[PDB]
Amino acid sequence: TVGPRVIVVGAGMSGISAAKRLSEAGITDLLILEATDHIGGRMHKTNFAGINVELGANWVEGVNGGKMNPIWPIVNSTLKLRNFRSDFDYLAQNVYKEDGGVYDEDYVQKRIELADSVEEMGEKLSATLHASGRDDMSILAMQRLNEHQPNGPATPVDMVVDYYKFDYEFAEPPRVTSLQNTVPLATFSDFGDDVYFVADQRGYEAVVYYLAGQYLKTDDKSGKIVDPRLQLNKVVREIKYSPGGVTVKTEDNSVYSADYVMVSASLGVLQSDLIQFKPKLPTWKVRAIYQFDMAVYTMIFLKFPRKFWPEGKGREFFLYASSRRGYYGVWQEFEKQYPDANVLLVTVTDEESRRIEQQSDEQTKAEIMQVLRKMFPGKDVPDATDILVPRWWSDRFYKGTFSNWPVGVNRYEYDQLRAPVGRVYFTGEHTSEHYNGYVHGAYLSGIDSAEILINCAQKKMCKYHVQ
Ligand SMILES: Cc1cc2nc3c(=O)[nH]c(=O)nc-3n(C[C@H](O)[C@H](O)[C@H](O)COP(=O)(O)OP(=O)(O)OC[C@H]3O[C@@H](n4cnc5c(N)ncnc54)[C@H](O)[C@@H]3O)c2cc1C
Numbered sequence: 001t002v003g004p005r006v007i008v009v010g011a012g013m014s015g016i017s018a019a020k021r022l023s024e025a026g027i028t029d030l031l032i033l034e035a036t037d038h039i040g041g042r043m044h045k046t047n048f049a050g051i052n053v054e055l056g057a058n059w060v061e062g063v064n065g066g067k068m069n070p071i072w073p074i075v076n077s078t079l080k081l082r083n084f085r086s087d088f089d090y091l092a093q094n095v096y097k098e099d100g101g102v103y104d105e106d107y108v109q110k111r112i113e114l115a116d117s118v119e120e121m122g123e124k125l126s127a128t129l130h131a132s133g134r135d136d137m138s139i140l141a142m143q144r145l146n147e148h149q150p151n152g153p154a155t156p157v158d159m160v161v162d163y164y165k166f167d168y169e170f171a172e173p174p175r176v177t178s179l180q181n182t183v184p185l186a187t188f189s190d191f192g193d194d195v196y197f198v199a200d201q202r203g204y205e206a207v208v209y210y211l212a213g214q215y216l217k218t219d220d221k222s223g224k225i226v227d228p229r230l231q232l233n234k235v236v237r238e239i240k241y242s243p244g245g246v247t248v249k250t251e252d253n254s255v256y257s258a259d260y261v262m263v264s265a266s267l268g269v270l271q272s273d274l275i276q277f278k279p280k281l282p283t284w285k286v287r288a289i290y291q292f293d294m295a296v297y298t299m300i301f302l303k304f305p306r307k308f309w310p311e312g313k314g315r316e317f318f319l320y321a322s323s324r325r326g327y328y329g330v331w332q333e334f335e336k337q338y339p340d341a342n343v344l345l346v347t348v349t350d351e352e353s354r355r356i357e358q359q360s361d362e363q364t365k366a367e368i369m370q371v372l373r374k375m376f377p378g379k380d381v382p383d384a385t386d387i388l389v390p391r392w393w394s395d396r397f398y399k400g401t402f403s404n405w406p407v408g409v410n411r412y413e414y415d416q417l418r419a420p421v422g423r424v425y426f427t428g429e430h431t432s433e434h435y436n437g438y439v440h441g442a443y444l445s446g447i448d449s450a451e452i453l454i455n456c457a458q459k460k461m462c463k464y465h466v467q
């Protein structure tokens with residue numbers, strides 16, 4: 001209301017998290033400009049065949065460990081969102097042959113245990129690498145080293161197990177992922193190995209709404225945010241920054257002045273031309289932006305007239321060992337979450353996401369049907385009534401689903417990604433110190449960014465030291 005003025009570009013988890021922390025400090029002259037018509041960003045539900053499923057984030061990841069994941073108390077106590085712990089203990093019983101049914105439980109268990117031990121060997125190696133990343137390598141290189149091969153898992157069952165362990169977590173092959181920064185993963189080290197599937201008709205986005213309503217005016221009857229400080233359908237296109245202040249222009253031609261700007265748009269948006277920076281960001285910052293990876297994670301949802309797949313103990317997750325790596329390979333069924341719904345979830349990432357997002361929904365369903373018939377021959381498997389293909393990469397406001405730490409990026413270079421430039425500050429999961437790629441990472445990153453700025457506005461400490 002009176003004092004420094006901060007524009008916050010974007011109202012996903014990090015934007016809302018940041019504005020909250022700024023408000024708490026007494027910086028209340030905030031203007032949040034959100035490109036879409038709602039808050040929540042990559043936490044977003046949608047109606048699929050009469051129920052509400054998540055287009056974006058779906059799990060609270062990292063529960064039951066030595067430290068409390070900040071997102072978990074919100075989900076499980078405050079809002080009591082309907083959720084289920086994901087059990088992956090039975091995958092060995094649930095691996096399907098490209099043509100002809102499941103593999104022998106015993107056989108798959110060996111391959112799984114084998115992969116697990118290579119990764120444990122990777123964890124030990126990781127623990128010994130220098131903080132500068134000087135002697136870091138790709139997850140694949142580590143695998144090659146342990147396996148004494150010129151290649152990583154290269155066999156239908158081994159590859160889907162590989163894909164399940166790594167691609168299904170990070171959305172890119174182990175080939176491009178940094179060992180030192182993903183194995184082991186600070187999320188699981190710090191907050192615990194368990195993951196909980198949010199299945200509540202309110203949406204995982206409730207967390208963002210709840211945090212938003214802590215400091216933004218909401219209607220007493222309705223509940224809707226009515227705070228003039230939050231502005232929806234406001235697409236930032238240009239940011240002008242001087243040593244004296246900043247200017248933010250939106251697509252509808254409005255121009256706003258501020259003391260500071262908090263950019264919360266995804267790494268992908270930063271990698272696009274959507275937002276122009278005048279003057280252009282320095283080389284150090286630009287290299288940092290283009291060297292990090294914005295991955296794609298596609299949650300394809302399907303609706304059926306009847307069910308034809310197993311149900312019961314250990315049946316929730318199952319794999320398809322295609323000879324074609326990452327081809328419709330990780331499957332989920334929702335007996336618990338959406339009982340009597342007849343919905344399957346197949347996940348695809350990276351190269352297959354970009355191919356699939358570009359192709360017609362029909363064609364995609366045709367491919368999926370062909371796969372499903374091979375997996376369950378002699379069951380009578382009906383065409384899917386309905387298909388949902390989330391197109392995050394295509395979307396100009398996201399251009400992907402979450403960041404991934406690539407090989408060749410060290411801690412210094414990652415810190416350059418987060419570093420402010422003048423009065424322009426950065427936030428988002430991709431700025432998270434140890435939790436990039438996650439809801440909690442975005443949440444904690446809003447707090448961290450906000451505090452760097454508060455330390456400038458109030459405390460007058462403005463030179464930020466990259467580390
Ligand atoms: C498909 C999917 C699956 C995932 N699964 C998990 C999971 O299960 N568990 C979990 O922990 N994490 C998961 N995540 C990651 C998690 O959702 C994100 O890390 C986190 O929500 C990102 O929040 P953010 O604030 O950093 O970015 P965003 O949510 O993208 O917020 C940025 C906001 O800025 C807006 N915008 C962008 N451009 C502009 C512009 N120029 N003008 C104004 N506004 C702009 C956008 O609309 C957006 O609302 C997943 C992500 C996706 C999408």
Ligand SMILES: *[C@@H]1O[C@H](CO)[C@@H](O)[C@H](O)[C@H]1NC(C)=O
Pocket residue numbers: 063064076077
């Ligand atoms: C979540 O909430 C339930 C029901 O209130 C509680 O009994 C359970 O212990 C909680 N789960 C975790 C992992 O904290």
Ligand SMILES: [Cl-]
Pocket residue numbers: none
């Ligand atoms: Cl072997």
